[PDB]
Write an enzyme that holds these catalytic residues in place. Structure first.
Site, PDB file in Angstrom:
ATOM      1  N   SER B 114      25.672 -39.763 105.360  1.00  0.00           N
ATOM      2  CA  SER B 114      24.814 -39.245 104.286  1.00  0.00           C
ATOM      3  C   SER B 114      25.321 -39.617 102.903  1.00  0.00           C
ATOM      4  CB  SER B 114      24.671 -37.728 104.405  1.00  0.00           C
ATOM      5  OG  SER B 114      23.431 -37.289 103.888  1.00  0.00           O
ATOM      6  N   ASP B 168      14.750 -38.065 110.357  1.00  0.00           N
ATOM      7  CA  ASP B 168      15.520 -37.567 109.246  1.00  0.00           C
ATOM      8  C   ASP B 168      14.604 -37.244 108.064  1.00  0.00           C
ATOM      9  OD1 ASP B 168      17.446 -37.185 107.097  1.00  0.00           O
ATOM     10  OD2 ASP B 168      18.871 -38.413 108.218  1.00  0.00           O
ATOM     11  N   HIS B 199      18.977 -35.546 110.822  1.00  0.00           N
ATOM     12  CA  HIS B 199      20.160 -35.778 110.006  1.00  0.00           C
ATOM     13  C   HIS B 199      21.397 -35.196 110.689  1.00  0.00           C
ATOM     14  CE1 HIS B 199      21.635 -37.116 106.097  1.00  0.00           C
ATOM     15  NE2 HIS B 199      22.219 -35.948 105.861  1.00  0.00           N
TER      16      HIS B 199
END
Lengths: 218, 218
Positions: B114, B168, B199
């Site tokens: 991320s 996601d 995610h």
């Protein structure tokens, strides 16, 4: 105030879904969905409102359509409760505006996606004291529900359908399931459906909403 | 100013993976992952840095491990370039530290999840003008890539693996796909791999990262 879209059904209307969009979208965002459903629901009007344009904190105070402010994503989703109750008051005026057109309150349904869904939960089970067809809650959650929630006899008899993605990263599957559990524990006829997706709407999820509305209306 | 976690391999280290966490997590978040990999990768050291604890705007100023500030999500994203660079400059220092121990640059990998992944793209393909073994990007994107991106001949030689969830909702699949397409358009050897998740990290994804790593160090 942008006026709501009113999508006319195939035959004269005797039912109505009021459908709220989520953060930053407009009245049109759900038009294609309302149209897919009107293919089988021949007498059901869709009323697509649009949220006030107002500053959204998580977006740098960017003005966009928003049912209430979100001021933090993590660790606690922090929101404007004052702005939610205004939106909720708006939707209740809408229901009344729809009854005046000759739709029986038992055939008016509220639907909401994401941020819109949180206003639909508050409206039906907190604010509304009359008959109501149903609540359809899409990838959402009830920030205003709590262990102190108590439902009147009327609110108890409003059926609800709660739909959610397994992989939703914005609204956690659990947060949506926690709103479903509030209502379930309180005697509300409530259905739960999950789908392999994220924070979005899938064609099969729309089919299931159609099946579920066609059952309530028949 | 907390120090990195350093996980020594079973055999004398001749390789290294610096692996950055995402927003709000700490250096311990990917320790289980690193451990799993080491059971297959016997001479690969893993250093897991932790991001400096800073106010984050989109979280209301809540203080938490953060690689760079995020000021707005929609509809124009806004991040702090200042903080991204200090994170990037601290990554480089960790590469020069590994070299100093006696690891060759071309056996050093950068990996990021991320927010951690945005820093790792920036360090590799914008800052770092030397040998490097590769870049592994999980559920991420490149905030500093753009139409004007041009790579040096050595930047072009850094291999990459970009991995993503189909569902996601924090960093869209399309945002990861765009980091991939900017890297592939500029002559980088990139591989793309998608998963039916959000995610998050799957067992199968870590499996794939190991086999990519095994190939690279063979």
């Amino acid at each position: 105030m942008t006026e709501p879209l009113i999508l006319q059904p195939a035959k004269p209307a005797d039912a109505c879904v009021i459908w709220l969009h989520g953060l930053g979208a407009d009245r049109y965002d759900f038009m294609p969905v309302a149209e897919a459903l009107q293919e089988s629901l021949l007498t059901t009007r869709f009323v697509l409102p649009q949220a006030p344009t107002r500053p959204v904190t998580i977006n740098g105070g960017y003005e966009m359509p928003s049912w209430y402010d979100i001021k933090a994503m993590s660790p606690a989703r922090s929101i404007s409760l004052e702005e939610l109750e205004v939106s909720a008051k708006m939707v209740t005026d809408l229901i009344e505006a729809q009854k005046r057109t000759g739709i029986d309150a038992s055939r008016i349904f509220l639907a909401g996606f994401s941020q819109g869904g949180a206003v639909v939960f508050h409206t039906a089970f907190i604010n509304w004291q009359g008959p109501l067809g149903g609540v359809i809650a899409l990838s959402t959650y009830a920030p205003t529900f709590g262990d102190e929630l108590e439902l009147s006899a009327s609110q108890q008899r409003i059926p609800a359908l709660c739909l959610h993605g397994q992989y939703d990263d914005v609204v956690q599957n659990a947060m949506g399931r926690s709103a479903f559990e509030h209502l379930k524990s309180r005697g509300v006829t409530v259905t739960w459906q999950e789908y392999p997706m994220g924070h979005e709407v899938l064609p099969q999820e729309i089919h299931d909403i159609g099946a579920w509305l066609a059952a309530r209306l028949g």
